[PDB]
Design a protein around this ligand. Structure first.
Ligand SMILES: CCCCCCCC/C=C/CCCCCCCC(=O)O[C@@H](COC(=O)CCCCCCCCCCCCCCC)COP(=O)([O-])OCC[N+](C)(C)C
Ligand SMILES: CCCCCCCC/C=C/CCCCCCCC(=O)O[C@@H](COC(=O)CCCCCCCCCCCCCCC)COP(=O)([O-])OCC[N+](C)(C)C
Ligand SMILES: CCCCCCCC/C=C/CCCCCCCC(=O)O[C@@H](COC(=O)CCCCCCCCCCCCCCC)COP(=O)([O-])OCC[N+](C)(C)C
Ligand SMILES: CCCCCCCC/C=C/CCCCCCCC(=O)O[C@@H](COC(=O)CCCCCCCCCCCCCCC)COP(=O)([O-])OCC[N+](C)(C)C
Ligand SMILES: CCCCCCCC/C=C/CCCCCCCC(=O)O[C@@H](COC(=O)CCCCCCCCCCCCCCC)COP(=O)([O-])OCC[N+](C)(C)C
Ligand SMILES: CCCCCCCC/C=C/CCCCCCCC(=O)O[C@@H](COC(=O)CCCCCCCCCCCCCCC)COP(=O)([O-])OCC[N+](C)(C)C
Ligand SMILES: CCCCCCCC/C=C/CCCCCCCC(=O)O[C@@H](COC(=O)CCCCCCCCCCCCCCC)COP(=O)([O-])OCC[N+](C)(C)C
Ligand SMILES: CCCCCCCC/C=C/CCCCCCCC(=O)O[C@@H](COC(=O)CCCCCCCCCCCCCCC)COP(=O)([O-])OCC[N+](C)(C)C
Ligand SMILES: CCCCCCCC/C=C\CCCCCCCC(=O)O[C@@H](COC(=O)CCCCCCCCCCCCCCC)COP(=O)([O-])OCC[N+](C)(C)C
Ligand SMILES: CCCCCCCC/C=C\CCCCCCCC(=O)O[C@@H](COC(=O)CCCCCCCCCCCCCCC)COP(=O)([O-])OCC[N+](C)(C)C
Ligand SMILES: CCCCCCCC/C=C\CCCCCCCC(=O)O[C@@H](COC(=O)CCCCCCCCCCCCCCC)COP(=O)([O-])OCC[N+](C)(C)C
Ligand SMILES: c1ccc2c(c1)CCC[C@H]2Nc1nc2ccccc2[nH]1
Ligand SMILES: c1ccc2c(c1)CCC[C@H]2Nc1nc2ccccc2[nH]1
Ligand SMILES: [Ca+2]
Lengths: 1105, 41, 168, 82
């Protein structure tokens, strides 16, 4: 068929002919007039029954000869005299003209379609996602009129209480009924032009203009609404999406459409809201101005089961007025003022031009309405009764379908309307069965409903009680909500295989992810023997600190808005925002690496940097409250996050705005001093004390009450507890600043000797100055061997990979290898006694030194970068050398553009040679640097150093060179200058941060560097290794000092979440925003109130007169 | 006192304290007219 | 993906069409340069015929680039071809080269001493100067990069805007 | 004139890139020493006798639904930004 729509659905056509009129108004032989003016109970004319066999049944008059027991026919059975057929219509209405050619859809189906057959097209054919609500509108069919307030206010709600939910509004479609006014709201309050509220307007095939235009299989019906008042067929209202053109076989008349409307409104109450919720999608009913049949069908809902509620609004008009007028009377139904039933019937008499014989049962119909004054939510539009109508509808469903507060909560959890919950469920005395609240948290978590999580926490859900092992196993193992495909890709990687078919994730498998994401030696609670034993076993089946487990969940499941919510709660907020930043960042790098799904990788690096900026903005807030304790917050062992540190994490997330913040730069300096007080002391005295060891004793140290915030080593804290003299030499030599200035004076004694050897002639054997030099590099090599073996990891593959990843561990390896190549060729060589420097092996190693020397002078930029003025230029000399490579390629294209012609034009008798590789590159390079070779330009001139190069064509080179240098100096060299000017301020505000971040890795290499410099560091290796064959810097806080510190972090977080609140709520652009929103809501209650005053004074002067 | 950022500050604080005595006062008016039309009727 | 659709998929990729020219052109500039720099005999050498061959087939590739430049007006095709910086320079560089080969090959030979024939010399020196047109091509190829090209485009927008400082 | 010409030479470059890439979609396969074969084997074969987006039918439909969607947002976000 190529169309499932017409494969399943059918169409009704009057396949028989039933006249309904006999009397010849004109032209006594009725056969003539019966052709054109005698219609069937088919509605269509007897000749409009084409129906090819029935077209030949346009015989003399038609089927059933004139007499035929005259009153015989007059029935038109819709069963056999109206058969079915495959649908000839199905398309997309264009609505040509009125707003950007808004679309809608239809089929033209028969009402034969069983209720379940009608639901199983709306979802899968038209891709209408299942609703959370249904706002069938059962008011007046004939057009009616409203007041400017109620017109727009009810247009606020049908947009508000339906855009939030799914809200398949059920209308009549036509531009005359309630369908009329609802569409007018859809334009005035035009929502964000998107999939807005998809109104599913059931239309009859009866009162419909352009019915022929609808007859097209996959046809864009060029539809146009004529407002011709002479017209009688009702045009479809403009603002309606998908239509259901119910086909009864007839035209012009009502009927079948009402049958479908129950029969879809009853199966959508049989479909479930969501996999998590067990309820069915509820149904409401709204009444605008009603009518006689309306007052009947309003009631039957209040009677029939399930109790479909109703939202009959009072202000609209004729019927709805009185159905609400009686709500102001008839208290609890059965109680009935018998003196008012003549009065209200007198109001019924005047509105419907209504009869008194019929005044008992219509009045009676309003009684059982009033016997059910519990779910008939008579919205008093006038006042603030129950709220704006948006809330009234959603409030009508909860209060009235005999539903537990849980069952009320699970619905609002689906709608994602919290305001309903805070003010109609979390109101007052209410049963709140505690197990229920727990189960609701399980649902708000799996989806993403942060706002109900906050709500439930703020109404008694202690996560300690609600975070057991099997519950949290689900929270990873749910497709019932926003999911991250990485997590099921990470787990199958670490398991090194393929997940079995079902595979509910175990929390062990998560630990193997976070220990892989965070990395290094991070060891999570899940993998440890305690958890791994109580887990396989199954308040021990709870967790100690739950929001540390949910925060690693919302960050593996890419639920930021939860992570920001679960981060700000709990404790350790600065370690949670630097673990998160390391989880995401370590997820983002997996995304870029493996491409099995969409990228997602820049969505995370923005999520990480959002956590890696709350930490930094929380360090500042602490550093601005107590600079001392705020440096304890960076070094206290955490013990929930793998015996780690709020500053070793940032370094692992490579977060520079923290490691290069001013509190991680004081501490790094207070750690750089050591026990020394280099505030009271001076750098002269360090060097003076290193070479005069007794001068160590004339130094101003710090007390162990000043070194509180500094992390100290294992035995370092042992000393201070249990200043004596042996604790002066230990305190100095184990200071980083001393470890530094005790190397820099061996290294600057290395470079003064190796340089002395490089420069001075070199004999068969090394000299005293040269053995000390070999000795440094050897012991400096070992110091880098040992720097690998003790680089705080278990994976040799990862230690070696992080060692060579630092700029100098390579260069040192280049410089250490080369030197022993050098010593290899220098010492491991023969000796040509008659003349040294003939042995090209000796020479070779000789010249390894003279070039290896350059590696060691650039070391000094490691030592020289300790300064805060210098280092940020040493880091610039690299960030330009990179960013300038392409200006410099051009300058080498300009250099061969000149050198190849200059060398060809001048030296034309050149056999192939390697000097043709120098001479095309040599002079044009020195030209850039002040040289011009002036007596070589114009080689035929008298003043020539090259009077032999003169010959045919050599007059071209002054021109080539003129163009060359113009391009070099006046264009390309000033393109460098211009480059270095405009990349200076950038690279200067980066090379600082790159420097302040390499400072960590520099200082915290001296806290584990030995004491002794690398000529005689070997003793501190000897006396660390043979003693090792016989068998970090932590913050030691007593017990109360942990307590005072936690009280400080809590205090500083509280201010952070309180000052941001102030900087925004008490800014300017926000303050203009409120002043706008106030003066909005003022001016409404100005003109409204001020009107009423004038309606008083015009009366008050008439009351007295 | 006659700048801009300060003048937005006051205009905020005024429209705060206005709007309190708008809705409060404007309520009471409606509680009169619903009565006044019933005092005479 | 079948095998014949691997070779068709690669060789008909632009990135491949590029890096399959830039390694013929950088093999052109390594040879023409070799000929420019090295002495030049009565007849071209192996390194020099390949060079003539590139420019010829590179000329045709620019002939055909006109005839298939998506238009009907020859007056408009030719006008949009010469309107690009290099279609001129290439025409300067292709003409000049065959002027060069014209004078280099279409010339006599003073056996006692080359470089006396000022026609030979003349074309010899067309090459040594035509070479500059082909090194500036590399700024067409080198401008594919998003860091480099935006300097190659600066070296022109300054040479224009600086003419008057340079007259002074 | 560096910051000017740098915020222009990018745009001049990104615009010559079209005319560069979309010259290779119609450049032959073979480089210009032996592109002649792809001329030979385009011309004598021519004596014997562009890059388009091939969308099925539904993909035109999904694309038009996308353009309509993105225009609607454009005329709706400007409305909000002001
Ligand atoms: C004395 C006579 C002989 C020597 C004189 C001649 C010496 C010649 C010159 C020498 C200059 C030496 C310094 C530069 C080399 C890299 C240093 C480094 O750590 O780079 C990186 C390690 O990046 C890695 O991926 C890990 C290891 C890379 C090793 C590459 C060696 C290249 C040099 C070849 C061997 C040359 C030895 C020649 C001798 C046989 C660090 O990062 P980055 O570099 O800042 O940025 C790159 C970023 N990246 C990490 C993502 C990649
Ligand atoms: C943290 C990790 C990074 C650091 C790496 C550390 C490791 C360093 C890496 C080194 C790798 C480089 C190769 C080894 C060097 C020698 C190569 C060579 O050419 O030797 C020559 C000498 O060979 C001899 O045996 C005689 C001289 C003594 C050798 C001293 C060099 C080894 C010292 C290493 C101490 C390192 C331990 C350092 C402590 C850890 C052989 O050739 P020849 O004799 O010249 O040829 C004769 C020719 N003729 C007769 C014609 C003249
Ligand atoms: C014909 C001549 C042509 C030119 C020849 C070559 C000369 C010119 C070149 C020279 C050096 C080339 C190799 C090293 C530099 C490359 C790396 C770099 O630039 O910076 C990078 C590393 O480096 C730094 O961040 C610090 C910079 C170190 C200073 C370099 C010493 C130069 C002095 C030598 C004096 C000796 C002179 C005497 C010698 C006899 C930083 O760059 P970035 O942008 O952050 O990139 C990302 C980095 N990341 C991945 C780590 C995050
Ligand atoms: C398009 C953009 C604008 C360009 C601007 C203008 C471009 C330049 C225009 C220059 C004017 C023309 C100069 C040459 C004139 C003829 C020379 C001649 O006959 O003999 C000369 C030969 O030497 C040469 O021919 C060498 C070329 C001259 C130097 C080129 C200029 C470079 C510097 C300036 C560039 C910028 C200057 C700016 C201008 C103010 C000398 O006489 P001779 O005796 O034959 O030689 C000695 C031999 N003998 C010893 C055996 C006897
Ligand atoms: C600008 C203000 C200054 C004045 C302007 C007025 C200009 C008046 C100029 C007139 C030029 C004609 C005079 C020379 C001819 C006579 C013979 C002669 O000397 O031949 C020389 C050829 O040298 C040349 O041909 C020189 C260059 C010619 C072009 C002149 C510059 C063009 C304008 C600028 C733009 C150009 C592009 C620049 C870049 C943009 C050879 O002589 P030689 O070198 O001594 O060699 C002798 C030895 N040998 C026999 C062994 C070989
Ligand atoms: C090997 C030995 C001999 C050669 C070595 C000596 C060579 C000497 C130097 C040569 C420099 C050659 C390269 C630059 C030429 C222009 C390139 C181009 O396409 O420009 C433009 C084409 O603009 C047009 O209007 C269409 C054609 C203009 C032709 C101009 C030729 C000028 C050189 C005369 C012949 C010289 C040949 C001398 C030889 C007899 C493209 O635009 P644009 O330029 O980016 O900007 C201008 C914009 N415009 C289009 C609005 C105008
Ligand atoms: C898209 C297109 C853009 C590019 C344009 C493409 C077209 C290229 C445009 C070219 C125009 C330039 C003029 C033609 C070149 C020769 C001029 C000359 O001086 O010739 C000389 C040689 O003449 C001979 O006939 C003998 C040598 C063979 C000639 C080969 C050159 C032509 C090849 C063209 C192949 C092009 C086809 C490429 C495919 C399209 C004549 O002078 P002479 O003999 O030295 O004089 C006597 C010397 N004596 C005194 C020492 C005895
Ligand atoms: C005495 C000597 C005095 C000086 C002599 C002369 C030397 C100085 C000059 C030299 C070159 C002069 C001719 C070419 C450049 C002119 C055009 C230009 O500037 O840019 C224009 C085109 O070009 C570009 O947009 C790209 C620029 C390419 C770089 C030029 C090559 C330089 C290298 C050569 C190395 C060889 C060196 C060795 C040689 C032996 C763009 O300009 P624009 O502002 O956008 O204008 C509008 C453009 N529009 C109309 C297209 C929209
Ligand atoms: C690895 C780390 C080691 C630590 C360093 C300490 C151990 C290294 C120390 C000493 C080792 C050498 C001892 C052997 C005897 C010396 C002989 C000698 O050369 O004498 C010369 C002086 O000395 C020198 O010229 C070289 C040694 C001193 C200067 C160079 C090293 C300075 C750095 C290290 C110290 C400062 C460090 C400060 C930096 C902050 C004098 O003799 P001459 O010049 O040949 O001429 C004599 C006259 N005659 C020829 C006419 C007869
Ligand atoms: C990805 C890279 C791009 C693809 C490549 C680009 C495609 C095109 C690639 C190359 C073109 C073809 C080159 C080989 C043709 C010549 C063979 C040869 O050497 O003959 C010659 C060998 O003989 P001989 O010993 O030199 O003797 C002199 C001969 N003579 C007397 C005739 C002078
Ligand atoms: C148009 C596009 C073509 C595509 C390219 C492929 C075709 C071109 C390939 C080969 C063509 C030549 C074949 C003939 C035989 C060679 C003879 C010869 O010169 O031998 C020399 C080597 O060769 C050279 O020095 C010149 C050729 C190779 C280097 C220059 C081109 C490199 C680019 C192309 C390739 C890489 C491309 C890389 C680009 C990214 C050796 O001898 P000599 O130096 O004279 O000294 C001898 C000394 N003796 C007398 C003592 C013994
Ligand atoms: C040349 C010079 C220094 C450097 C390099 C290259 C490569 C990266 C390592 C860096 N060294 C370094 N020493 C420091 C001391 C204090 C603070 C920051 C420091 N950074
Ligand atoms: C010197 C250098 C390059 C150029 C000129 C002159 C003249 C204009 C054409 C330009 N070449 C070019 N190649 C490109 C490759 C990629 C993207 C953009 C590109 N622009
Ligand atoms: Ca100078």
């Amino acid at each position: 068929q190529k169309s499932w729509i017409e494969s399943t659905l059918t169409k009704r056509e009057c396949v028989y002919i039933i006249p309904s009129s006999k009397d010849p108004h004109r032209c006594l032989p009725g056969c003539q007039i019966c052709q054109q003016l005698v219609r069937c109970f088919c509605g269509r004319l007897v000749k409009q029954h084409a129906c090819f066999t029935a077209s030949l049944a346009m015989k003399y008059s038609d089927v059933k000869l004139g007499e035929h027991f005259n009153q015989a026919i007059e029935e038109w059975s819709v069963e056999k005299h109206t058969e079915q057929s495959p649908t000839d219509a199905y398309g997309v209405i264009n609505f040509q003209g009125g707003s950007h050619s808004y679309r809608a859809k239809y089929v033209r189906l028969s009402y034969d379609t069983k209720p379940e057959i009608i639901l199983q097209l709306l979802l899968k054919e038209w891709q209408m996602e299942l609703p959370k609500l249904v706002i069938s509108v059962h008011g007046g069919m004939q057009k009616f009129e409203l007041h400017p307030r109620i017109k727009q206010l009810l247009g606020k709600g049908l947009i508000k209480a339906a855009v939030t939910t799914g809200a398949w509004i059920l209308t009549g479609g036509v531009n005359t009924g309630v369908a009329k006014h609802v569409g007018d709201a859809l334009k005035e309050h035009a929502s964000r032009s998107s999939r807005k509220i998809c109104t599913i307007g059931i239309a009859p095939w009866g009162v419909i203009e352009n019915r022929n235009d609808l007859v097209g299989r996959d046809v864009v019906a060029p539809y146009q609404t004529l407002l011709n008042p002479l017209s009688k067929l009702n045009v479809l209202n403009n603002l309606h999406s998908h239509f259901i053109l119910v086909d009864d076989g007839t035209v012009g008349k009502y009927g079948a459409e009402v049958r479908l409307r129950r029969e879809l409104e009853k199966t959508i109450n049989q479909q479930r809201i969501h996999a998590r919720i067990g309820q069915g999608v509820p149904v409401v009913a709204l009444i605008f101005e009603g009518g006689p049949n309306v007052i009947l069908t309003v009631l039957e809902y209040l009677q029939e089961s399930p109790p479909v509620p109703v939202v009959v609004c009072e202000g609209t008009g004729r019927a709805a007025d009185l159905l609400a007028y009686i709500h102001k009377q008839t208290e609890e139904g059965g109680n009935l003022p018998d003196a008012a039933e003549p009065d209200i019937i007198s109001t019924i008499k005047k509105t419907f031009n209504f009869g008194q014989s019929e005044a008992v049962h219509l009045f009676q119909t309003m009684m059982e309405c009033m016997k059910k004054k519990e779910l008939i939510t008579v919205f008093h539009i006038g006042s603030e009764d129950h709220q704006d109508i948006d809330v009234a509808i959603l409030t009508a469903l909860l209060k009235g379908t005999n539903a537990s507060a849980f069952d009320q909560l699970i619905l609002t959890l689906a709608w994602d309307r919290v305001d309903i919950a805070k003010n109609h469920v979390f109101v007052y005395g209410q049963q709140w069965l505690v197990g229920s609240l727990e189960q609701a948290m399980l649902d708000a978590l799996v989806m993403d409903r942060v706002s109900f999580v906050k709500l439930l926490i703020e109404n008694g859900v202690s996560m300690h009680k609600f975070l057991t092992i099997p519950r949290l196993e689900e929270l990873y193992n749910t497709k019932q909500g926003p999911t991250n495909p990485m997590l099921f890709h990470l787990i199958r990687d670490v398991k090194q295989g393929n997940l079995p078919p079902g595979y509910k994730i175990t929390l062990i498998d998560i630990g193997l992810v976070i220990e892989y994401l965070m990395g290094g030696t991070y060891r999570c609670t899940y993998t440890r023997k305690r958890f791994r034993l109580i887990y396989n076993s199954l308040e021990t089946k709870r967790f100690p600190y739950p929001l540390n487990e949910l925060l690693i969940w919302a960050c593996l499941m890419k639920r930021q808005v939860m992570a920001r919510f679960l981060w700000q709660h709990g404790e350790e907020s600065m370690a949670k925002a630097l673990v998160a930043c390391k989880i995401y960042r370590s997820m983002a790098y997996e995304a870029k690496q493996s491409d099995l799904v969409d990228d997602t990788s820049e969505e995370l690096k923005q999520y990480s940097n959002d956590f890696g900026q709350l930490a930094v903005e929380l360090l500042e807030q602490s550093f601005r409250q107590d600079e001392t304790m705020a440096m304890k917050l960076l070094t206290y062992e955490l013990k929930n996050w793998s015996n780690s540190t709020c500053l070793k994490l940032a370094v692992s997330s490579r977060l520079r705005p923290f490691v290069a913040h001013t509190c991680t730069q004081m501490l790094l300096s207070d750690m750089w001093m050591g026990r020394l007080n280099m505030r009271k002391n001076s750098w002269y005295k360090v060097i003076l004390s290193i070479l005069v060891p007794p001068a160590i004793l004339m130094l101003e140290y710090k007390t162990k009450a000043e070194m509180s915030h500094i992390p100290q080593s294992q035995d370092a804290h042992q000393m201070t507890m249990e200043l004596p003299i042996t604790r002066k030499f230990y305190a100095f030599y184990h200071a980083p600043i001393v470890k530094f200035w005790f190397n820099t004076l061996a290294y600057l004694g290395f470079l003064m000797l190796y340089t002395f050897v490089v420069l001075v002639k070199m004999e068969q054997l090394p000299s005293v100055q040269e053995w000390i030099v070999i000795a440094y590099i050897f012991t400096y090599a070992i110091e880098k061997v040992r720097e690998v073996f003790m680089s705080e990891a278990g994976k040799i593959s990862q230690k070696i990979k992080v060692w060579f990843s630092d700029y100098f561990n390579v260069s040192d390896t280049i410089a250490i290898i080369s030197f022993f190549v050098g010593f290899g060729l220098r010492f491991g060589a023969k000796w040509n006694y008659i003349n040294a420097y003939d042995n090209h092996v000796f020479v070779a190693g000789r010249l390894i030194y003279c070039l290896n020397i350059i590696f060691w002078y650039v070391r000094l930029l490691d030592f020289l970068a300790v300064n805060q003025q210098a280092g940020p230029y040493v880091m610039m000399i690299g960030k330009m050398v990179a960013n300038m490579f392409y200006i410099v390629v051009i300058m080498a294209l300009v250099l061969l553009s000149f050198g190849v012609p200059r060398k060809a034009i001048l030296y034309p008798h050149e056999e192939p040679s390697w000097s043709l590789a120098k001479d095309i590159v040599f002079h044009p390079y020195w030209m850039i640097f002040g040289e011009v070779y002036a007596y070589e330009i114009d080689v035929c001139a008298n003043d020539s150093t090259l009077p032999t190069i003169c010959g045919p064509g050599t007059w071209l080179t002054p021109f080539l060179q003129a163009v060359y240098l113009f391009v070099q100096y006046i264009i390309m060299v000033n393109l460098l200058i211009a480059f270095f000017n405009q990349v200076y301020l950038q690279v200067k505000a980066i090379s600082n941060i790159v420097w302040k971040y390499q400072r960590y890795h520099f200082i915290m290499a001296y806290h584990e560097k030995p004491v002794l410099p690398p000529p005689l560091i070997i003793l501190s290796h000897i006396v660390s290794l043979f003693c090792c064959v016989c068998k970090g810097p932590k913050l030691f806080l007593t017990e109360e000092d942990q307590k005072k510190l936690h009280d400080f972090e809590e205090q500083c977080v509280e201010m952070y979440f309180d000052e941001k609140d102030d900087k925004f709520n008490s800014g300017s652009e926000e303050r203009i925003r409120v002043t706008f929103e106030r003066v909005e809501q003022m001016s409404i209650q100005i003109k409204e109130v001020g009107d009423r005053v004038n309606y008083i004074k015009r009366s008050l002067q008439s009351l007295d007169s």
